[PDB]
Structures are given as structure tokens and as C-alpha cells.
């Protein structure tokens, strides 16, 4: 299983030192692995960076490791550190209280932990059950005093393994397969290739292709992966699905094979969008309302109109904000689905769907090209 964790806190409080101590202990944006799972460790300098990573899906965090120094205790910005975690969807936090290891005062440390739990509770987390480990990242990194160094780091890792859950596969959701390509197998039939977005597919399940003028329905007779004939496929797997009684002409890229009547096309969406800077290959100038770029999602593309939030009349490169987008026509756009926006031959933005509001009269009255 793969887990994404990010380290938040004041730079002078030990983050980088701890991250290094963990690296050296397990050697016996970084990556390490405990007995339980594969870890993707992230440590972004700012709020806008974590939000960008969430929207883009580059490093969607499953949990955070809040590093606080015993001497200073929480800083005023510790509040913004937790607001950020709360905002990007992190619901599990593990705390590491880093100390001057000079065997100082257990009482002071106790008050630090107490204050931290008050804060955690304040921001919706369960401050009473949050694992709080006390130690010295510096001792652990310098192979000195194992009781405060090594011990604390091992305890932190155990706490991360236990309290930060793995990212869900959504295998409980109806299977959804974006069709990437179509081809035939002599004597067997037509095959559609693609990568399952969610749910599970079993040799024999009934399917239905969406995105086509006509609604096509049939059955999956065979599953193929690595030229091996399986009977079950899982979310995330790239496969070939053998369809029953259908010719290549009846299918194409862009269609979506899903569990019969499980998906409802959407034309109006609200989403968190990040606008690319010119340095990232985006636009030089800002774009305003009624800007019509092309949305690319799954294996399809469609024109859409951007509706800036009330009040805002422009959006600048490098900014992220919530926007309303109206597709020229309904498409398979689910909540949690990511997309990109292209103007001409270049991407100008990235998005993550937050809501699928009902199309309003006003939205219907839109005047297109």
C-alpha cells in the first residue's frame, strides 16, 4: 500500500532534521518504507504549495506529521499549519515534540503536549487520541542517546503506520473504465483498453458505454492483463476488456464503460482550480469570466465556460480558486475527478471537481460560439 505524508511546522523546529533521521534509521520529496507500507514523504514550504499539490493530484496527502519544538511550543502560525491540513482534506495528524534534549523539564513538555491537544481539538481533530511522540531529532540523526533519539523516531514511525490510514481505492463504487483504445482478437471479439478509475470488474459483469449518442449495453466476457486471461480486475489496473457482440466500429476512445446505470452525465461543475504560471507553461496574462478553454478529463475533451466567483472579475497566473465551469454538453464528470484546461496547444490550468450542481436557467441561457 502507498501512503502520502507531509511534515508541517516551523522550519527551525526540526522538520528537516527529523526527515533526515528517519532516512538514516531506515537505511539499515523523499521516499522510505516501514514494514507496513511504502511512504512518500513531502515537506512543502507553504500553504499554496500543498493546495496546488492537492488540486493537481501530484502528492495528495493521507496525513501530516506536525513537528513542534518543546522550548517554544506552538507558534502563532501553528494555527495556519492546521487550517491548511484541514483544508486539503487531511483528517489524521501525528505529532512529534522535538526538544533541546538537555533532559530539561518533563512538566514543561507536558504543558506543550496539553496545548497542542487543545489546538488539535480546536481544529476538528481528535486531540485526545492523536499520537504525540517526544524526542530529539538531532540525537537520532547523530547516532547519539538512543533513548531520546532512535527510540523516539521508531515510535514516530510506528505511530504513522498505525494512525495514518491508507488511501481508499473506492472499490465499493461502481466500476468506471475510460476507453483508451479499441481492437479485435480473431475468433474472440472486440476489446477495449483502459485503466479502471474505481470499483472492481469481474469477468461476466454487465457493462454500458457512455458518451455515445446511443446508449450501448452488453457484457464483459473476458479480462486481459499482461496477455494473461483473468476473471477479475481492480481499480488502478490497466487492462483489456473483451466485450460481447460488438464490433470495433461501435466503440472509440473517449467512451466510458461503467456498471449499468451507475453514472449520470454532468454539464455543470464547481471545482478547485490552479492556474499555471508562464514558467509552468501557462499564460502570461490573466483570464476573465466567460473565457472558453477546452476541458480534458479521463479520455475525453469538451469545450467549457468559466464562471468566476461573484465579486472576482479576474484570476491571475499562479493562483488557485474555486470556479464554476459549464460544459458545452454533459460528460462523465464525477466528484473527485481531476481535469485540465487547454487554450490552443497548451495547458493553462488544472482542476479537481468539488460539486455537480444542478444546471440553472441562467446557465442554460448561455450564448456559445
Amino acid at each position: 500500500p502507498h501512503v502520502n505524508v507531509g511534515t508541517i511546522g516551523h522550519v527551525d523546529h526540526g522538520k528537516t532534521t527529523l526527515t533526515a533521521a528517519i532516512t538514516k534509521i531506515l537505511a539499515e520529496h523523499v521516499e522510505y518504507s516501514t514494514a507496513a507500507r511504502h511512504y512518500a514523504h513531502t515537506d512543502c514550504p507553504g500553504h499554496a504549495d500543498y493546495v496546488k499539490n492537492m488540486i493537481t493530484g501530484t502528492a495528495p496527502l493521507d496525513g501530516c506529521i506536525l513537528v513542534v519544538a518543546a522550548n517554544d511550543g506552538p507558534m502563532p502560525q501553528t494555527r495556519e499549519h492546521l487550517l491548511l491540513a484541514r483544508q486539503i482534506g487531511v483528517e489524521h495528524v501525528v505529532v512529534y515534540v522535538n526538544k533541546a534534549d538537555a533532559v530539561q523539564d518533563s512538566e514543561m513538555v507536558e504543558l506543550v503536549e496539553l496545548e497542542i491537544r487543545e489546538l488539535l481539538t480546536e481544529f476538528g481533530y481528535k486531540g485526545e487520541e492523536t499520537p504525540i511522540i517526544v524526542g530529539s531529532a538531532l540525537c537520532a540523526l547523530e547516532q547519539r542517546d538512543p533513548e531520546l533519539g532512535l527510540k523516539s523516531v521508531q515510535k514516530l514511525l510506528d505511530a504513522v503506520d498505525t494512525y495514518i490510514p491508507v488511501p481508499t481505492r473506492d472499490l465499493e463504487k461502481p466500476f468506471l473504465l475510460p476507453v483508451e483504445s479499441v481492437y479485435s482478437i480473431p475468433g474472440r471479439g472486440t476489446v477495449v483498453t483502459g485503466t479502471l478509475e474505481r470499483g472492481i470488474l469481474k469477468k461476466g459483469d454487465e457493462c454500458e458505454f457512455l458518451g455515445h449518442s446511443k446508449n450501448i449495453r452488453t457484457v464483459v466476457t473476458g479480462i486481459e492483463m499482461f496477455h494473461k486471461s483473468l476473471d477479475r480486475a481492480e481499480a488502478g489496473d490497466n487492462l483489456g476488456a473483451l466485450v460481447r457482440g460488438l464490433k470495433r466500429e461501435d466503440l472509440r476512445r473517449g467512451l466510458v464503460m461503467a456498471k449499468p446505470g451507475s453514472i449520470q452525465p454532468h454539464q455543470k461543475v464547481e471545482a478547485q482550480v490552479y492556474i499555471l504560471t508562464k514558467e509552468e507553461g501557462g499564460r502570461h496574462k490573466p483570464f476573465v469570466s466567460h473565457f472558453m478553454p477546452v476541458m480534458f478529463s479521463l479520455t475525453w475533451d469538451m469545450a467549457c465556460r468559466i464562471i468566476l466567483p461573484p465579486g472576482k472579475e479576474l484570476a491571475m497566473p499562479g493562483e488557485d480558486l474555486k470556479l464554476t465551469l459549464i460544459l458545452r454538453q454533459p460528460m462523465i464528470l464525477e466528484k473527485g475527478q481531476r481535469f485540465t484546461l487547454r487554450d490552443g496547444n497548451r495547458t493553462i490550468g488544472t482542476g479537481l471537481v468539488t460539486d455537480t450542481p444542478a444546471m440553472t436557467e441562467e446557465d442554460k441561457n448561455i450564448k456559445w460560439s
Binding site: 500553504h47 502560525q77 504543558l111 479576474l314
Partner: protein, 276 residues
């Protein structure tokens, strides 16, 4: 003991200073809360300067642009810090306010004309030597030190700009990427700030939207000069403000957009946090 632990926590909740500083304050004042608190405040300034010297030199590309308009004076200030987590913190924002008010007070004491508008700037050094508000003590340089000691990040009073306007002139303004913070009355904080100085006999009460829109145009199109109504449209790459394709309608230039409203653009200021 439980009693000493309680005193330490009580002093922490009350003042916000670090636990170690609170502990040293209490033992120094015999465990007397009132004396400990007074002691901590007295040390604050010294601690700040020292901390400011230590962190001095670190990269500070993040921060905020502050816009404060009082009467016929308008000030734009830029204060930098290391992380956007801090630029989002109230303590930092309160410092920006003190910097704006300090600038405002300084300006409302400078050159005040009747026939035309007055404009002026202040570099880092100049802004730093400015007298802190009648509230605090010392210069903004001292207040900056206090903030640096409270937030633990290097910070810089980057620059300021002010404008004073007599009747016959109007200032349109806009801050982009505004931050919510209702405790700082009249102040508007964000990543981009623009002032557009105009000459007009139209009542100010009917120019609020136009004013905001001109500001939006400056932020979004970043003109390098005012230009002229005599020049021809310049396309999406134009530098002269008046010839640039109007932000909210490229069909027309900014000059063609504003002229009809009985307003002429004579000057402007554009601040982008962390630029250059």
C-alpha cells in the same frame, strides 16, 4: 509540582511567549505572575532585535501588500516574510497595519497641494526609520523586530507609496487576492495592489466601480506607462496603459473604456508582493 505547572501554563495562555521564556521569567520573579509578565514584556524588544539579527539575510519572497485609504490620502505598503503561513497569520497582518498607519501619519504631514495631486515613495531604509504609531514605541524598525521575535521568521519593510488628492482628482484602487481580516478596519491586504490616479470633475460617489475596474486593469495588464489617447491600439502586448486592450473587453482600449466616464488617467502605482 502541579501548582508550579499551573502558574507556567497560566502565564503562557496570558502572554503567548515561549514556554522556556515563561519558565525563566517565573523563576526570576519568584513565581509571581504579575512580575513575570512585566519582566517578559520588558525583554521582548531586546529578544526581538537579537532574533532579527540572527535571521537577517534569509530569503523573504512571500508577504503582503497593504492598501489604506484615509480621507484624501492613500498608501500602499509591502512587508515581506519567509512563508505564506505567516503572511496568513493575524500577528503578521497586524504588523502590516502598523506599517500602513505609520506611513499614512507620515504622509498626512508632508506636501499637500491644491492645484494637483502629490505622489511619493519610501525605500526600505526610509520606511524603517519611520515613527511607530502613537500606540507603540520607537520606529517601525522596532515593531518589525517585535514581530520577528513573535513569529520567528525574517521580515522586511520592503517599500511604500502614497498619494494625496485635492478636489478635481480621484484615486481608483484594487487589491487582488485579498485576505479576510475584519479586525483591521479599512485596511485591505493581498498579493497585488494598484492605485490609479485620475483627473475628473465627476462626483466621487459615482466612480467606485470605475475606480475598482481601472485598478483591476493595472493588476491584470501590468502597464509600464500611462501612454496617450492619441496613440493607436497596441494589442495584447502593449505597454502604454491607455493603448492596452481593456481588461474586461479587449475590443476596446483602456482609453476608450475610461474616456466616456468623464475621467482621464494621469498616473498609477502597481505593487506585486515579492516582485524584483
Amino acid at each position: 509540582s502541579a501548582s508550579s505547572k499551573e502558574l507556567l501554563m497560566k502565564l503562557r495562555r496570558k502572554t503567548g511567549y515561549s514556554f522556556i521564556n515563561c519558565k525563566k521569567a517565573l523563576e526570576t520573579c519568584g513565581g509571581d505572575l504579575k512580575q513575570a509578565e512585566s519582566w517578559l514584556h520588558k525583554q521582548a524588544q531586546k529578544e526581538g532585535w537579537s532574533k532579527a539579527a540572527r535571521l537577517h539575510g534569509r530569503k523573504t519572497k512571500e508577504g503582503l501588500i497593504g492598501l489604506l485609504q484615509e480621507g484624501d490620502t492613500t498608501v500602499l505598503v509591502e512587508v515581506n516574510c519567509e512563508t505564506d503561513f505567516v503572511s496568513r497569520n493575524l500577528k503578521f497582518q497586524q504588523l502590516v497595519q502598523q506599517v500602513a498607519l505609520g506611513t499614512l501619519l507620515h504622509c498626512q504631514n508632508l506636501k499637500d497641494q491644491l492645484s494637483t495631486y502629490s505622489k511619493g515613495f519610501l525605500n526600505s531604509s526610509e520606511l524603517s526609520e519611520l515613527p511607530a504609531g502613537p500606540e507603540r514605541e520607537g520606529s517601525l524598525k522596532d515593531q518589525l523586530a517585535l514581530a520577528i521575535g513573535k513569529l520567528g521568521e525574517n521580515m522586511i519593510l520592503k517599500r511604500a507609496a502614497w498619494v494625496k488628492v485635492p478636489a478635481g482628482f480621484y484615486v481608483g484602487s484594487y487589491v487582488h487576492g485579498a485576505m479576510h481580516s475584519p479586525s483591521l478596519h479599512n485596511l485591505v491586504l493581498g498579493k497585488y495592489g494598484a492605485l490609479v490616479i485620475c483627473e475628473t470633475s465627476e462626483l466621487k460617489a459615482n466612480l467606485a466601480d470605475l475606480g475598482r475596474r481601472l485598478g483591476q486593469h493595472v493588476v491584470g495588464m501590468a502597464p509600464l506607462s500611462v501612454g496617450s489617447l492619441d496613440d493607436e491600439p497596441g494589442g495584447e502586448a502593449e505597454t502604454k496603459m491607455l493603448s492596452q486592450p481593456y481588461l474586461l473587453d479587449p475590443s476596446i482600449t483602456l482609453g476608450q473604456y475610461v474616456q466616456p466616464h468623464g475621467v482621464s488617467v494621469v498616473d498609477f502605482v502597481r505593487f506585486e508582493c515579492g516582485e524584483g
